[PDB]
Amino acid sequence: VSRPGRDEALCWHLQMLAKVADGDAQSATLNFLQAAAAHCTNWDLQQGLLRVCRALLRAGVRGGLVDLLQVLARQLEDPDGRDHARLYYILLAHLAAPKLGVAL
Amino acid sequence: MGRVLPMLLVPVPAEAMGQLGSRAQLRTQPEALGSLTAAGSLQVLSLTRGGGRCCLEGPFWHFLWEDSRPKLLALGENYELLIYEFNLKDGRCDATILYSCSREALQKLIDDQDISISLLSLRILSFHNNTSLLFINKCVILHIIFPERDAAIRVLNCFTLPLPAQAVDMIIDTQLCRGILFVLSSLGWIYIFDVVDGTYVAHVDLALHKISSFTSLKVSQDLDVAVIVSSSNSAVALNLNLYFRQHPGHLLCDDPVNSAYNMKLAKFSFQIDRSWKAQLSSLNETIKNSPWFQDILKIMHISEPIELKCVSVTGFTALFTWEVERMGYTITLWDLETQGMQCFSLGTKCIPVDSSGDQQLCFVLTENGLSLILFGLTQEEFLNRLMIHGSASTVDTLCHLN
Amino acid sequence: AFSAGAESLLHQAREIQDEELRRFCSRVTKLLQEAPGPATVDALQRLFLIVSATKYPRRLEKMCVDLLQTTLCLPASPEQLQVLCAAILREMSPFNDLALSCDHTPNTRQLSLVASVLLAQGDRKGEIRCVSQRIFKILENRQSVRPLLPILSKVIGLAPGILMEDQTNLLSKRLVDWLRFTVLTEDQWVNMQAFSMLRKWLLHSPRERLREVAFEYCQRLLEQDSDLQKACLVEAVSVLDVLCRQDPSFLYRTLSCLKALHRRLGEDPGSERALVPLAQFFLNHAMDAEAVYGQLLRGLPSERFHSPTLAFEVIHFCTHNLALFDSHFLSLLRLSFPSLFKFLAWNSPPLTAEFVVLLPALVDAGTAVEMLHALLDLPCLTAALDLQLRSTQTPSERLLWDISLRVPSCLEAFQDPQFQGLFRHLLRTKASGSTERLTPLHQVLKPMASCARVTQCAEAVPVLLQAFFSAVTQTADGALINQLALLLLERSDSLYPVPQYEARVHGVLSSQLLVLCKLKPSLVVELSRELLEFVGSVSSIHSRASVFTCVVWAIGEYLSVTKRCTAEQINKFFEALEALLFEVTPCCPPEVVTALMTTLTKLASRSQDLIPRVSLFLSKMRTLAQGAESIRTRASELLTLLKMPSVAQFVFTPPAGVCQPRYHRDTNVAL
Amino acid sequence: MVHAFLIHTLRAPGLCRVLYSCVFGAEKSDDPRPHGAERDRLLRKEQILAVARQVESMCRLQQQASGRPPMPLHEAPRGAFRLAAENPFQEPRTVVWLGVLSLGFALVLDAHENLLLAEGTLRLLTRLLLDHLRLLAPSTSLLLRADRIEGILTRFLPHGQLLFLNDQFVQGLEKEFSAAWP
């Protein structure tokens, strides 16, 4: 998340981002992901990105993600990634903490 | 279609409502509900069973619970400020007095800052992390601090208002919103100062937005939208970024070689890499695509509310409180982005309880007790969302309680 | 040309050391005050090179600057040195230390040099007014005036009114007396300057005699000796149009002049460029929709599409007066778009950044269903025009074409009667009814579909497509929506195989069919048969590996229970999806598998029985799975999240406001 | 109008750096920062350099996609273009070119100037520069001898204005300039 997010290695960054994202450092991760949203044109990065969002889902972060997931769902390229984000945003916004681990 | 969604997550009999005051404020957690009686007694109805009442007697006319977004701090008639702690353990409405401040000590602390003004009036502004901001004499924004180990109240900052005494004594509201201390003068100006440094970081021309007597103004928690409610039951909300830019006069806040010169030639600025392959991307982008606080680091008229104090204002919504004896309480909700309003009329035995926290849904104390008023949520939809969130026990409880 | 010695000289001029610069300034001091001989020029040339080739400022020692200024003020200097110093002071500008003056040299040519020195400053110190006033005062005496007239013209170019009304009328009478021979003595010498800036003078700013002689001199530049004749016809027409603008009665006169010229201007090859100003004059004051405008829109581009400057003139006239377009003109420009596409085929680089503005300015109601195909067959248009050149040209002049690639197969196929009508539709001057698929002609033009010009035209189709859709995505109804959907479903894998062409038309068409579906959710519902056949075919995923994802996602999401829908349509679509998933599991990519899982599991949670079908088959597919990881994981969102029916019933059919960032914070306010 | 006359290099199918960039005027210029010299000079330089790059692109693309003797009066590549406001001009202008060998001379002319005259004049000027100066080997005669170019334009192209010179008037100007230098 140190880089602004204009690299060509984004398809390699998002994999670690998904494999590590949690509820410790929120705002920096959200800013980096927001910047990277514009640099996703192929389905692979558009699935690594929602892998990151799903990792946040599982972590349990609530606020602001109602906008990060929203912006990802509203401003991606492939329809499948956008629907993925819509489903995961709904899951985080409408579930209690345990039921998400039991019904997601 | 904005009638009600009037739920109730805890009951309270009218026996105590016949003893409580006309206005009240609730902690974010269910810690208390303290209300001000006209006799000067501070009644606290613990809505954390049965709910007995606690009484705090004195010449108190101003107080505010610890809004950590209950530790009640109040100032008497003699400008003596006190802090008393109420503990809601197992329903025992027991209170104790912890910290007291005398008028002589307050005048001494005011004078020690080389302020040759006698304390004539102290109005509160905030109470957070045991640190209180007070607009002393309506002119000196003295940021007190009541620290641990019974340390004396010493002003960690005291900046006189960078304004003449003509308008310094006409201040009304002292609102702290993430450090951008705003002091409203009744003549129609808001001198946004910074509590960190004291600078007149900006200034807002409420007059240029075109009545008078701005009673109170509400700041969004992101310093994004501000709505000022005058004494004439009129509220106007305009965007800080737009209201500072659209009237900026009042705001006091080969490859490279040509490209960096475009960064310093500032009469204009090229957009230079002038091929005939990257000049199509410009056309594609044009076809496809076709704040203020950064530097400082319609109208509501219900055709007369007594105290039109909006409970809280968010980025896209605004919730207000209005109470009338003739018909009851009228609760209003305004959508900042959608410009819609939902006003509901309630019974004549009900008063607001300012949830000094994060849940900005009008928690009105009704005859049966606690009542969280929402908009647009059907009982089936609400219970279904609870079930899609948890077990059926919660749905059963919320359906049975009414 | 380009010698390494020249590059070395430029690099030395750019990177001359500061101490070396001071030494050179001292040499200039000791060499200019001395007897200035050939050493003077041999040093001034190097000074000019070292000052000119440096973008960043070079404020050298003052003494050199005052020496240059005084030399300009020193009349004994020769013409060469005076000109070089004038260049020195007209390139080093703008400086706030303008020690120069506007009345420092009596010589008229030196006065021109001083003006060139002064005008290159700017209005930072009120300079232009001072230079204009000084020039007027210096011209107030007897003048000559011919040498200094260009300074006047440039001043009015940069300053439109500072020439006072008295001074303006003085200039007017001077020019009128200076009008008078023709191209086809001192008097004619000033006549040349009078003609050389007439249009700018009229735009920025005896009179009976003016109408007698000089007013007709505009056409006398042409009417009243071959290349200059062409260069002067355009000036004459432009001056006539300027007279129309400044005088409404002159519009009819210029129109009559153009009508009289139409005897030859419409029949003289090599003179076609003079009609573009005539077309502009007709638009601002409409020409013959059949003959004149007809040739301008569709006649010229089918015969002279190989002139890269004529095409710029035509399309720039088209995009510079689109604001003042009329209904009949709109219909005309909307009629001949396949022919206007010839220029984009042949002269794309200077005309595409111009079609991007033009295309949303001729959109009609039903032409889109054919206009998409016209855009689709553009590289083949270029190839067909190339064959047209190869088979009609005398070998003597043939340099104005391309006959330098694989001829024989395509030329033989030109005379092959199998393709005598389709080419007459691709190369058409009009489109009044849709034609057949260009697959046969695509197989014909394999050898040439990789030309340089065809590859040029192939890169201007995506952006034009985006412009056209963005002009129609906001201007569409039901019939248009369905027609466009069918158009894309057809043209998915029916394109001319020009390299890196289908990979862009695919992207635009698919990602904008998405836009149509989001404009109207019922597209999948009304399109049961075509989409069902498409998904049921493996070949669709085996040849359209990046559009199949879109249709399967749309079908999976837009089978919404919440008046033309029927409960059995979900089952029929599920049958198609089940067959496709069984058969499938450029072939289907790791995206089609996940989208297929998503569509199946999210389409079987709207059917009561199909949940057990999922538990039997989609659970089986998960277990076998238990871009492959995404395929395995995706289905959970409507297997585990659709096992429970109450929550799953509503999420997959959400309301209209889950997108805007504040529409739900009150929906958890019911406790 | 003519904003500028150019001589710049043209690459073959190394940045295109103008060998001779004569700007025939100025532009109105106000920033709150006091009116400087770095800013105005850098602006009036980068504009011309951008025009040079655009003409290089046009010429190269014309060369590949013409087929006309790939790699002579009417046999040299020719064309026209239009610029973009704020990238980097204020008033938009047409650009006219005519490239010979590897010396593409350009003209930045206002939309109220004759195109055919611009092309004819640029042709005559580039003939005059190829012959009078004769840099078809000693290219240093174009940078260290910029005074010859200065003389030629100052004679034929007075103050950013094009003239309808004919045989008699070209004879007059030939009588004017021919002996002024050895």
Task: Please describe the topology of this protein.
This is part of a larger assembly, with chains A (104 residues), B (402 residues), C (671 residues) and D (182 residues).
Chain A: H1 10-20, H2 26-36, H3 43-59, H4 65-74, H5 79-94, H6 97-102
Helix pairs in contact in A: 1-3, 3-5, 4-5
Chain B: H1 14-17, E1 24-27, E2 33-36, E3 42-45, E4 53-56, E5 62-64, E6 71-75, E7 81-87, E8 94-100, H2 103-111, E9 122-128, E10 131-136, E11 140-143, E12 157-160, H3 165-168, E13 171-175, E14 182-185, E15 189-192, E16 204-205, E17 216-219, E18 225-229, E19 235-239, H4 240-245, H5 256-262, H6 279-289, E20 299-300, E21 309-313, E22 318-324, E23 328-334, E24 341-345, E25 353-356, E26 362-365, E27 370-373, H7 379-389, H8 392-400
Parallel strand pairs in B: 1-25
Antiparallel strand pairs in B: 1-2, 2-3, 3-4, 5-6, 6-7, 7-8, 9-10, 10-11, 11-12, 13-14, 14-15, 15-16, 17-18, 18-19, 19-20, 21-22, 22-23, 23-24, 26-27
Helix pairs in contact in B: 7-8
Chain C: H1 4-14, H2 18-32, H3 38-52, H4 62-72, H5 79-91, H6 108-119, H7 127-139, H8 145-158, H9 165-178, H10 186-196, H11 198-204, H12 207-220, H13 227-246, H14 249-261, H15 275-284, H16 292-299, H17 308-320, H18 327-335, H19 337-346, H20 352-358, H21 368-376, H22 378-390, H23 408-415, H24 423-426, H25 439-444, H26 452-458, H27 461-472, H28 478-491, H29 502-519, H30 523-526, H31 528-536, H32 538-543, H33 548-557, H34 567-584, H35 590-603, H36 610-625, H37 628-634, H38 636-643, H39 645-651
Helix pairs in contact in C: 1-3, 2-3, 2-4, 3-5, 4-5, 5-6, 6-7, 6-8, 7-8, 11-13, 13-14, 13-15, 17-20, 19-22, 21-27, 22-26, 27-29, 28-29, 31-34, 33-35, 34-35, 35-36, 35-37, 36-37, 36-38, 38-39
